[PDB]
Nucleic acid binder design. Structure first.
Ligand code: MN
Ligand code: MN
Ligand code: MN
Length: 430
DNA sequence: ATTATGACGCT
DNA sequence: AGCGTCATA
């Protein structure tokens, strides 16, 4: 009764850019705006690999992971922008710099957690309290929430989509108790007002549109964000969770999209997140371990405690390249040439990082894949990173992997390498 | 022959 | 430390 924690202590948002690499290319090239468009890496193998897709192109069935030649079969007029190539490899610098643009704007509203190149979580709890205090019992007008969906509404006793959005919002605001500064529903609502402001600033100052979710924790914020993409934000209330989760496939929840999620389904013989409520915490711990079990027990009730970390910068800087099929590296000088290419890009990015962010990486991780290995990385070794010098770093990387060569004579490399990866880690202030 | 990343958890 | 899992453009 008075003691069950309801996980409504925080207001958390997740802001995620719409079709992000496409928007970066569309800002740069106005000819691509309002068109079926995709961003592609490489070209020679089946037209290149698609890694981002405009919403116009999604209507034709184009997706990420698609080869551009196959995408062209679905959408003949699909426009394509190519990822930059430098030193023999895809180079994602334009998108990393566009990301920084957005992260720096978000950081004006609150401390953010960078969660990917195109999204960040925001803990808005403190900001909400302050916006509430200067509101002074003022109701929140629908005009302050022009792009907001309230999940689960309208409901109960118009066939257009913007009309439905407003009816839901009206029901939500009609039910609110703006008199209570400690009311979670009110706090989420004010949270949504702030996120409209944040999203407006992002679009105003970069030209990029985004979506967002507002809830009481990260997992619900992430889920909410996706519910009404693109260019809209969604509020998922604590009260909306039972209905939402009652038909929500388990795999849809962040962290459950892989093997653990499949095991929850198989072991418990269930399909939907809501079905998890019928197991005791000990039961879930018994199958999925102490941490996962407790996490699942709270999550299916809409409760999660993972904090929004104060980290705006990536904590690693890495360079990697696959060498598929018959391009696998089979000679020493080949291996060394590509270690140098990767190292030169790493040096460039590292030197820029040091000047911008007052830190130095101290560890170099070197990873390779060998032909005939199922897994993504075959071998991972670390060595000291003491100087931002590409030739030193590549020479060092070679030294850590020299012995992986199974060939008798030194000139050949066997079995051939299908992946090289250099990653700088363990930053210290400088 | 989706590729190029990046964070977190386990032992 | 090195490996595995999960995630995102
Ligand atoms: Mn996105
Ligand atoms: Mn994203
Ligand atoms: Mn995506």
């Amino acid at each position: 009764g008075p003691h069950m924690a309801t996980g409504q202590d925080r207001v958390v948002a997740l802001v995620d850019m719409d079709c992000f690499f496409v928007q970066v290319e569309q800002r740069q090239n106005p000819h691509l705006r309002n068109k079926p468009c995709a961003v592609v890496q490489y070209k020679s193998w089946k037209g290149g690999g698609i890694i981002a897709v405009s919403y116009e192109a999604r209507a034709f069935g184009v997706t990420r992971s698609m080869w551009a030649d196959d995408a062209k079969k679905l959408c003949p007029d699909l426009l394509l922008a190519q990822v930059r190539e430098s030193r023999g490899k895809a180079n994602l610098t334009k998108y990393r710099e566009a990301s920084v643009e957005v992260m720096e704007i978000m950081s004006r509203f609150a401390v953010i957690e960078r969660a990917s190149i195109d999204e960040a979580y925001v803990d808005l709890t403190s900001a909400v309290q302050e916006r509430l205090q200067k509101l002074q019992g003022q109701p929140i007008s629908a005009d302050l929430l022009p792009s907001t969906y309230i999940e689960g509404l309208p409901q109960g006793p118009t066939v257009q989509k913007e009309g439905m959005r407003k009816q839901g919002l009206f029901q939500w605001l009609d039910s609110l108790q703006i008199d209570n500064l400690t009311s979670p529903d009110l706090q989420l609502t004010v949270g949504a007002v702030i996120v409209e402001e944040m999203r407006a600033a992002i679009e105003r100052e970069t030209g990029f549109q985004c979506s967002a979710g507002i809830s009481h924790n990260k997992v619900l914020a992430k889920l909410a964000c996706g519910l009404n993409k693109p260019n809209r934000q969604t509020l998922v209330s604590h009260g909306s969770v039972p209905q939402l989760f009652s038909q929500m496939p388990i795999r849809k929840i962040r962290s459950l999209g892989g093997k653990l999620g499949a095991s929850v389904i198989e072991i418990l013989g269930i399909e939907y997140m809501g079905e998890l409520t019928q197991f005791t915490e000990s039961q879930l711990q018994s199958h999925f371990g102490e941490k996962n079990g407790s996490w699942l027990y709270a999550m299916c009730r809409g409760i999660e405690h993972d904090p929004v970390k104060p980290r705006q910068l990536p904590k690693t800087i890495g360079c990697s390249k696959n060498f598929p099929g018959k391009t696998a590296l089979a000679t020493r000088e080949q291996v060394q040439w590509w270690l140098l290419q990767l190292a030169q890009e790493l040096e460039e990015r590292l030197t820029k990082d040091r000047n911008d962010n007052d830190r130095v990486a101290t560890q170099l991780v070197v990873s390779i894949r060998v032909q005939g290995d199922k897994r993504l990385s075959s071998l991972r070794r670390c060595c000291a990173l003491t100087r931002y010098d590409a030739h030193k770093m590549s020479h060092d990387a070679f030294t850590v992997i020299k012995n992986c060569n199974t060939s008798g004579i030194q000139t050949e490399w066997s079995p051939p390498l299908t992946m090289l990866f250099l990653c700088a880690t363990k930053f210290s202030a400088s």
